[PDB]
Amino acid sequence: VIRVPLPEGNQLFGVVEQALGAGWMDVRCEDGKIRRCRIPGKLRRRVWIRVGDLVIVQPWPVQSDKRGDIVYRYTQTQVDWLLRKGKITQEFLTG
RNA sequence: GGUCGGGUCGAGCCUAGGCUCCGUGAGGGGGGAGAAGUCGUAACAAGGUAGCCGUAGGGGAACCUACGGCUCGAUCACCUCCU
Ligand SMILES: [Mg+2]
Numbered sequence: 001v002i003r004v005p006l007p008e009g010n011q012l013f014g015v016v017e018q019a020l021g022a023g024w025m026d027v028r029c030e031d032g033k034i035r036r037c038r039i040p041g042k043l044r045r046r047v048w049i050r051v052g053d054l055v056i057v058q059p060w061p062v063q064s065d066k067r068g069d070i071v072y073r074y075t076q077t078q079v080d081w082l083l084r085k086g087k088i089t090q091e092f093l094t095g
Numbered sequence: 096g097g098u099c100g101g102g103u104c105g106a107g108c109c110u111a112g113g114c115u116c117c118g119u120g121a122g123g124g125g126g127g128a129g130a131a132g133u134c135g136u137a138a139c140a141a142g143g144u145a146g147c148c149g150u151a152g153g154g155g156a157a158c159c160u161a162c163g164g165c166u167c168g169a170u171c172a173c174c175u176c177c178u
């Protein structure tokens with residue numbers, strides 16, 4: 001079929017609003033509470049993330065409010081591919 | 096031994112008068128770390144206006160300009176002074 005970063009384990013879907021700075025990313029998920037993603041060191045080299053890139057992250061059971069952590073990105077050949085299956089509704093990106 | 100009178104040493108207790116210690120503090124100010132946030136290019140080569148020191152004025156910010164000094168300034172010419 002296809003190998004896509006679905007929610008495996010406890011993953012989250014990160015669609016960011018603004019970069020306050022130094023790696024903090026305010027994310028706007030379907031969950032509601034303002035989460036603030038940060039980044040590991042394996043990908044800070046070869047990839048390039050910005051706004052509008054729906055990507056996958058991972059949250060942390062501490063306070064479940066401001067969490068998230070990048071593990072892998074999405075390429076433009078998947079971001080809109082993930083619409084027809086309805087796995088994610090894009091109206092969590094226009095309001 | 097008790098009671099009244101007079102002096103003498105007296106800790107505490109109360110008043111107001113100055114000092115400092117002590118945690119909680121509205122609001123303000125700089126310091127140090129994070130370097131996939133934004134604006135520029137000040138320094139190092141003659142860093143593209145040579146850099147730096149004292150004093151005063153100015154500017155989003157590194158910074159700019161006027162007077163007096165230093166070489167820890169590079170290139171061409173002509174002198175000058177010696178080995
Ligand atoms: Mg310059």
Ligand SMILES: [Mg+2]
Nearest residue numbers: 142143144145
């Ligand atoms: Mg200069």
